[PDB]
Design a protein around this ligand. Structure first.
Ligand SMILES: Nc1nc(Cl)c2cnn(Cc3ccc(Br)cc3F)c2n1
Length: 435
């Protein structure tokens, strides 16, 4: 049951009126066509983005006016014989002035990366509007004429270059559409076949998202078959635009980067610190282009503090579940501590650490912070030993415990090396009893 909407109903009665871009705008357009994007296949991504925004603007308008909603879809068509690719949306259109003035608008001209000659038809959703044609061949000269038989919305016909004939093949185009636009907000059809199925749940309100939805999305982005033990839905506007979901896999030992439901990097290792590479999920942000590493540090630092705060707030909600989490992922937290350059970052990550104490029963864990909360009046004392009993009957502990202080217990060499590297936490110093 193929559902297609694209066909030839457009015609131009009169002649076109030739126009020419300014020298400056022409230099920018050629940049978009050659010097702006690394992947020439992303022109499909951009046009789908445009089509989607156009559909939203139309919907929001109709919903606001209380009017009924028409078919709101995005259609792509490939034609190998004619060597073309078409994309039409039933969104809000473009007026004549927008077909002239405009050139949103930048993403469209990205089509001239693979196009020698492009044909465009648009008609505003405004009642009593006229259809118009737009033509250009890559130079700074475009044509505009009044066209009839133009459906409300926008239809973009691209005539691919000689070495870009690949984008006229259904196989190639399906690959690209499912890569960058699997979460498009409107129904997307390719040659009559439905493509998009997935819902960008990170855009929703956290309270409205259902647990089975998180489970579905986790299995998609992490390509796993288990469930997540932790889920953080973080949305913010103040620092930067951020729509993200983070998962902690349930099993023991690649966050995606999106922009407005549009994929950018499947592997976004740089978005988070190296010690947080066990995290799975997605980060969506409008404040992102376009390798890359400029303002990314801003985001990477914002997410690091939110995730640290997250894991802290989790321990005080379920200390036992967090204990198992620490046991399973403490490796990454120790690594992060030692790896860190600045001291403040070390003590931040260290807030996630957990050890046993002399003032606490065996099996119960405490943080460095909870230790200092019980510090009377100087320093932080610890002792590394094979087990709890061997540490309790130790002479060094008997000397320390007999007088005043709570003493921490660690039972692995890597736990001791971590505290030694940390040198000091908060306003106190980490000191071994064997000294
Ligand atoms: N699909 C779609 N829908 C709408 Cl409403 C708009 C508005 N601008 N653009 C981009 C664009 C397309 C053609 C030309 Br010529 C200039 C230009 F900026 C749109 N694309």
């Amino acid at each position: 049951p193929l559902h297609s909407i694209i066909s030839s109903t457009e015609s131009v009665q009169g002649s076109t009126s030739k126009h020419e871009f300014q020298a400056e705008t022409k230099k920018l357009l050629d940049i978009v066509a050659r010097s702006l994007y690394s992947e020439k296949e992303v022109f499909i991504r951009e046009l789908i983005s445009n089509a989607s925004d156009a559909l939203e603007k139309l919907r929001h308008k109709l919903v606001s006016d209380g009017q009924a909603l028409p078919e709101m879809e995005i259609h792509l068509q490939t034609n190998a014989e004619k060597g073309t690719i078409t994309i039409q949306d039933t969104g809000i259109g473009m007026t004549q002035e927008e077909l002239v003035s405009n050139l949103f608008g930048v993403g469209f001209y990205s089509a001239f990366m693979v196009a020698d000659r492009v044909e465009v038809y648009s008609r505003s959703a405004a009642p009593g509007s006229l259809g118009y044609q737009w033509l250009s061949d890559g130079s700074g000269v475009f044509e505009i004429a009044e066209a009839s038989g133009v459906r409300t919305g926008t239809k973009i016909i691209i005539h691919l270059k000689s070495d870009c004939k690949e984008f006229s093949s259904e196989a190639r185009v399906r690959d690209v559409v499912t890569k960058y636009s699997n979460f498009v907000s409107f129904p997307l059809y390719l040659n009559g076949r439905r493509m998009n199925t997935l819902q960008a749940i990170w855009m929703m309100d956290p309270k409205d998202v259902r647990e089975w939805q998180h489970e579905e999305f986790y299995r998609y982005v992490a390509q796993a078959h288990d469930k997540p033990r932790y889920t953080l839905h973080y949305k913010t506007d103040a620092p930067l635009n951020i729509r993200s979901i983070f998962y902690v896999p349930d099993m023991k030992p690649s966050v995606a980067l999106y922009s407005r439901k549009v994929l950018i990097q499947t592997k976004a290792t740089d978005i988070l610190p190296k010690w947080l590479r066990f995290i799975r999920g997605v980060v969506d942000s409008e404040d992102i282009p376009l390798q890359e590493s400029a303002l990314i540090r801003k985001l990477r630092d914002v997410l690091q503090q939110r995730l640290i705060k997250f894991f802290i707030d989790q321990s005080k909600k379920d200390a036992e579940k967090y204990a198992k989490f620490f046991e399973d992922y403490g490796l990454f937290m120790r690594e992060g501590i030692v790896t860190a350059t600045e001291q403040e970052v070390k003590e931040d990550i260290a807030k996630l650490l957990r050890y046993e104490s002399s003032a606490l029963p065996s099996g119960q864990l405490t943080s460095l912070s909870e230790y200092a909360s019980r510090m009377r009046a100087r320093n932080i004392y610890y002792l590394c030993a094979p087990n709890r009993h061997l540490a309790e009957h130790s002479p060094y502990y008997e000397a320390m415990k007999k007088k005043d202080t709570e003493v921490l217990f660690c039972f692995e060499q890597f736990d001791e090396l971590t505290l030694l590297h940390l040198r000091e936490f908060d306003k106190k110093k980490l000191i071994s009893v064997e000294t």
